[PDB]
Amino acid sequence: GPHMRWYPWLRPDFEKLVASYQAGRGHHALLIQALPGMGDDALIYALSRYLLCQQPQGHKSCGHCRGCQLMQAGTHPDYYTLAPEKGKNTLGVDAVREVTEKLNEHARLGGAKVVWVTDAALLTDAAANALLKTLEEPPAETWFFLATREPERLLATLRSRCRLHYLAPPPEQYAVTWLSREVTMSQDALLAALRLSAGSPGAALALFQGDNWQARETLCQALAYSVPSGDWYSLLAALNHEQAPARLHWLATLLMDALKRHHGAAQVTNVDVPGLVAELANHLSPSRLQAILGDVCHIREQLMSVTGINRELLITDLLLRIEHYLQPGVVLPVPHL
Amino acid sequence: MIRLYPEQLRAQLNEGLRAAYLLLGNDPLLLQESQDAVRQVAAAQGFEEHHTFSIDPNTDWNAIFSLCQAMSLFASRQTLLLLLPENGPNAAINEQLLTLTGLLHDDLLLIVRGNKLSKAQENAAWFTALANRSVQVTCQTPEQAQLPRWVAARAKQLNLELDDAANQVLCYCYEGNLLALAQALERLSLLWPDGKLTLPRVEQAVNDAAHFTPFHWVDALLMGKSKRALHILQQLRLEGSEPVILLRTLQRELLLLVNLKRQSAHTPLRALFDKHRVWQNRRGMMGEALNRLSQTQLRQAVQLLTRTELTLKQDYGQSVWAELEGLSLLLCHKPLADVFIDG
Amino acid sequence: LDDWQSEVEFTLPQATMKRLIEATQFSMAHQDVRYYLNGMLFETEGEELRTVATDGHRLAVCSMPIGQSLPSHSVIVPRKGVIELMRMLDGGDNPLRVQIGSNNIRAHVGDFIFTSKLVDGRFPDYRRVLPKNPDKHLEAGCDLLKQAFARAAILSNEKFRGVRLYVSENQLKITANNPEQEEAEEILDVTYSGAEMEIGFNVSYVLDVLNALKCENVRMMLTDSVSSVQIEDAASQSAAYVVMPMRL
Amino acid sequence: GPHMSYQVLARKWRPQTFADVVGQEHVLTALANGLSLGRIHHAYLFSGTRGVGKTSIARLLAKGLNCETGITATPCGVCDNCREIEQGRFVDLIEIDAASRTKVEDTRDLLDNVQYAPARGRFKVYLIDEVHMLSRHSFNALLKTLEEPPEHVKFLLATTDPQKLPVTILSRCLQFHLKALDVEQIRHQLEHILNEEHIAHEPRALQLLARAAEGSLRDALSLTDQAIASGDGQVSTQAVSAMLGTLDDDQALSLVEAMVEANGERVMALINEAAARGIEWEALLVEMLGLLHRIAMVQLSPAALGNDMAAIELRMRELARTIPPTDIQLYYQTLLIGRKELPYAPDRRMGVEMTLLRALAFHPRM
Amino acid sequence: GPHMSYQVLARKWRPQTFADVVGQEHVLTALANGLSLGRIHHAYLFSGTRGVGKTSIARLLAKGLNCETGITATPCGVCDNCREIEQGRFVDLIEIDAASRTKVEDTRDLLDNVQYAPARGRFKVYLIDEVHMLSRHSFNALLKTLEEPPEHVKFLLATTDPQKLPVTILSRCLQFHLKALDVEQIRHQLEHILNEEHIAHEPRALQLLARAAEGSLRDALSLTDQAIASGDGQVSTQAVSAMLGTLDDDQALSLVEAMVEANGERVMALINEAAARGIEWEALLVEMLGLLHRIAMVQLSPAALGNDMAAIELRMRELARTIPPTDIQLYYQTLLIGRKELPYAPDRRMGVEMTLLRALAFHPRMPLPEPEV
């Protein structure tokens, strides 16, 4: 069936959206807002299997029409998926233009057509802007589908003409119960990983299943080593990687939990590791702690913003910046205007 | 297969020909003049008809026409001069070469010319079959420190007198670009057949046309010589490599140097270089490089470098290449910047 | 691919479809912003299978009677499908069975049925494009006009193959210019009577039209300089062409 | 298979007559004066923010230029040419998806056939949408045709922003800046549309949809269509309030007063409670900025509060009494900078926490 | 007669005699002197910002060269060749829209055809417009012909950014830079255009159009046509002001004076008046910044005020005399920060209100008093 396994919390929204697509008053451009890995793409695939099914019933595809076997076979001339090319993290304007020009003709099968964009935010500005005038005035029986982490990042014009359908991550008790049903280790680290993932159970599942957990353990051990001594340089050995911004996010999360502990907040994101946050609060002044926080976040967004930048250099310069900030009598950054 | 130097390839050329010849190595001009010497030696000998073939993938072997059929009006033997691709050939071409050798006539000579090949390309079927009788020879341009002796030796071979100042200005202006060096030597010889050139007009007949690969750039910046670094950057003009290569280079050595300074309190710098075998001709040039610095100095360097790193790639700056002039010069006379930049 | 409804059957020699397509293929759009402009319009009438091709500035419509009752239906077929269909025509003895659908065009030739996807658009009303008054009408020998236009066009402007008719009483004057100024003038004796008039227009298009129809005696109809010219053969009215003027 | 496919409001209610357009009084008056008086021009570019109507104004102008009545200020709407332009069949209105058809090849192709007379209409209108994504060569190719086109061809440009165009093209067209539509115009148009569409609506819900659209008919109308899916058949205040994530409660000013008094624990507790309830963060900081503005304004001139501000005056005037004038502006600047950096933060809640901690860093004594 | 055709002011009023030009001296004089002295150089490039006359100057010079009589600096408007180039599509003027001719496949054809002699007049004038759009191979192809063209070929190259050209092309041909026009010249041209158009006009509206034209005459003429459309066929200060969005309404000097006098109530009243007027706030802020800048410039040197701004010069001088430079800098920085933060303000009116309030309360000589302690 769906590539990503069905998630139980996605059932209600499905029905609601199916309702909007049964009366014929679907918006033909249903920009899904869901946290990455939470199951936005699964919902898109279920919906598109419904729509491109020329013989559906109720609220679920027949699964018997040979259109459905084309769907499960992964090949269909009325199903245009736009994904980044293998090895490149952006989908070009060439692919979007090809899809739009191919969508010009009728439906091959005597039914509807669906263009599904794998991730809206990854669109190049030229590519995204070339998708206008095709989802604003689409051909008859044309449906679009887009998924994103945060709609505000998109181009303003493109977001303007798309029905922004939100998905809420499940309540933390339900999410931790599901994780414990699927994932095995302690509930404390489970909750910590869930919080690190902005509340998305799928990303916490991905962090635990992958090697990211052992990487986080090594990084937190290195932090425990570095904080009393001030040898932040060693942390480079755990930061420089293909997935560097995620670990920088972990570091910033630790810093913010330290600042909250200084303010005495009861609930913290890194609750699984009280020793680290306690040490961070003890050894670092809040005035310099917020400076460390700001530079960490700035460098994170620079790593994740500009494509193909030398992560090693920026990470090491960050580490040297903390080295300077540890030294007393230094000017601290102020968020500029 | 012998893997010798052309100073001996001349000796094997003077003696009986050892079947196919393969001269390799990236050469500014030495490859072409060695080819010319081979051509004249062959012309003195039997083989005279030099058929030029460009070895390349997706290009069929028209050489088989010469290989299968013998010349009919003037046989006079003949020589197939093969031009290898800059990355080396593929397996199909490597085996078709063996097929050609199977088609080799007694009056046929095989000359294969190219750059250094990969081990699989080096140990292909054709080379393995030709390892019994053919020869292999390689050469490379002289280094910066090896230039003056080579230039003086060439001048003495050409029967023209040079001077220390003339050699200095030549090795500065023509550093590793032997074609330009040879043309300048001929120009100085023809301009004045007096045979005495000390420093009268050698600069007048010599321009600034030389290659400059990035590895030497830090070699100046580590001394912090303002005028020397500025002149090196001005020399880099008109052969301007895109900034990313230079940036990768200096970020490599500065990360290495900052790691070295962090570990300097630990195991000494020599045994630390034992890990950092970057072959900077001794690993001791870096040893005298690390003598003149400070931790705050490294901070001031890394701040500017990392600010440039986002200055060229985040927003595609156009002055960023000239920014390489800015970053290298400011470090020369900056013991430690009292913040005021802290980028 | 499955079968389709709204599927009227045709029985016609391949020569009929070949004549039709060859009559209205040179005036079919090629990579133009108007997406419906590509391909040919096949429209079914009780009288014929009319076909319409246009670039927006060459409107060629052919009408070969079919002898069968045809429910009114209008279709647009893209350029690729039309070219392939014309390639699959030969022989002239086998009956071609053209099967129309909502989104596809199928065709049975001999023992093979081939299909083509169908452009989604609403093609313009060609009848309104055709001029509403043929007040100035002239007839002239087809081959004579073709030869004269070729002669004039050999000095015409290269990028804009543009000549100018000057129609006077029983006389056609062709005048052509180009960069590196060269003037080509040619006078033809025609069967014309009416108001003196001049009109500039592309000559490649008119040469193409005359090549397509190639009758004994052509006649064209026209009113004013801005007005488009409607050219057909004087024998029948099965094929009509519309050429839009140069200048203004 | 609905009526064509525009069961969505965004396409169904695009105006068909200059009388049916909302706002844009200056540009509509200018176009009507030009059409009726006879002063016509070959190149108009309409520049304005998204969802204001530059495409619609351009198409309506194209209708008005080619109506069989003559060059009429108000298009017929019933005559054959207007019907054809509505269907898109009209062979002289050459619309261009210039964002999609960017290559200079196609610009040259469409410029070669400019000399031809129009097929049926008076003028051969070259409507170009999203002009700003033309490649530089295409922009410069359009130059000599934009400047002195033949007598019968007229260009229309419809770009999101004007400053990306080269200054050469920007100096050869009439720059009509479409003024963004204020809240009242949006509310009136939305109420009229809903009354035509026969679905019950509440005035305050329409006020929310107007104030959240930031001046755009397309944005507000899409938001209403989203609410119709949520609020069954009706744009109800509760449903749109929950969907839009508005700050119905008073926790906004509560965490304002917690933040200005350097109560980190209280601010964190309020943030945790709001995140648990399901708040939206951008609206939170917008409300912060508004409340701070009201506090500062009554700090300067009292009796400036209105409605809800005039009701919570008991707290607002006390805050204006206790907070110095200098620190109010600093809090406002910090909050607005945080709102600026909300997109550049992996988690929205984490971004708001960062902003609040930056604000509390002004007085981080305890 | 008045010839009521209503066809685009820009195209109707393109200069046709050598004297109708707006007042470019350093290029018109040079061209006239060259044509008088017989020094007709075979290739020269006109540069300058958009809509100054370079494409027009090229047409005038081709008119002058190919006149029926001897080469005359001031072309006649009666001979067949001048009439033809006047009407366009002239036989010997080959106007090449180089932006449409960039492939070398066409420049090669051009250099192929260049040899054949012209039929009428003396020269054949290759007016290659938008030169900078030619592809590199086309430039290199043109190089040898430009160095030594035949006797009867002149190359009229015109472009907007000559720095894009390969430097050798700049070397081959002369270089005439056309300076952007002054406000007085452009206003005089607008007066002439409207007077000949028999359209009533108001001096303030013409000054507004000249100011907003950014020193390029076609911008002013397009704006004049747009204002003629905006009004009921007449150019009025009210129509131009409302169409441009300028703040001539209630000026802006009242707002800045209320700022320096620290009267919050006056600022509020002016803000409410502007809001009822429905003005855009960013334009108001830009006006305030410009006022501050002019005040500072006058404080450095009283001759900085423009003649177009001679309406409020006394109060301008007084504000320059009173406010110390540091307060002016503080106001400028505060208002500039406000303008930067306007897109991120909760509302443009509210953001401008707080920017005014911040620049008021931080005024050192009269700050907003601390409430209690």
Add this chain to the structure above:
Amino acid sequence: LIDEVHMLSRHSFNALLKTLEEPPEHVKFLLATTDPQKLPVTILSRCLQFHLKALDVEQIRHQLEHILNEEHIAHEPRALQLLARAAEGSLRDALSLTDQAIASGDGQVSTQAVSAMLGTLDDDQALSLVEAMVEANGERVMALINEAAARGIEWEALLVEMLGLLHRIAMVQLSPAALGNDMAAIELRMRELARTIPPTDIQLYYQTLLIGRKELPYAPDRRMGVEMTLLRALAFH
């Protein structure tokens, strides 16, 4: 004579190489270019390259003097130094500019036509404003801003050059000969402000110019922004 060889296609270069390797003895053929780096190394190595140097200012000046004396045109020396300086070294450039000078000067290349050219050849502007910032010179700042406005160079680049000059000045303050090769023609005036001005004032000026650049694009006009930067710099000391 195959002029401008750098435009030959790759296969064209291969044909040229096959002709050069076995050239007929009875023929030769020259060759010319402007960007020699584009030729293949084989043909460059084969050909006996001569490199032709850019003309010096004195060479161009004397040649132009001779040319003007040859036909009939009177000339004054300062105009000729100006023409040579603006020629940037190319003799053909000097001849094109002397044609323009003759045209504007009505058959006489006097100092006034080349003064009209002076608006184009006037280059040294960024250093004078830096020198005039550290004090109140009166009309110097107004004249320089008028020149910048009438010249319309990139204001962002102008202020970046200002910042670079000021930063190297601060570098010289902490090192008596920090660059040395910076502005060899102004090694007798720039040094005074390189050492006399206190480093604290230099840091404050750097702060002012950095703040001005950071806020420059948001000014009503970039000319107004640079004016305000200059006024702020002149406001303090």
Add this chain to the structure above:
DNA sequence: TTTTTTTATGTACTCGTAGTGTCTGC
């Protein structure tokens, strides 16, 4: 002695190849 390491999108040019009009002594 083998050593790190930016893109998307567009525009030209020149070399094969492939397909097709047209027509010439075969």
Add this chain to the structure above:
DNA sequence: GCAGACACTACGAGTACATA
């Protein structure tokens, strides 16, 4: 006839360059 010449025109690829 006529197929093969012979021309001619269009398309892909490999390369060089530009600009954001």
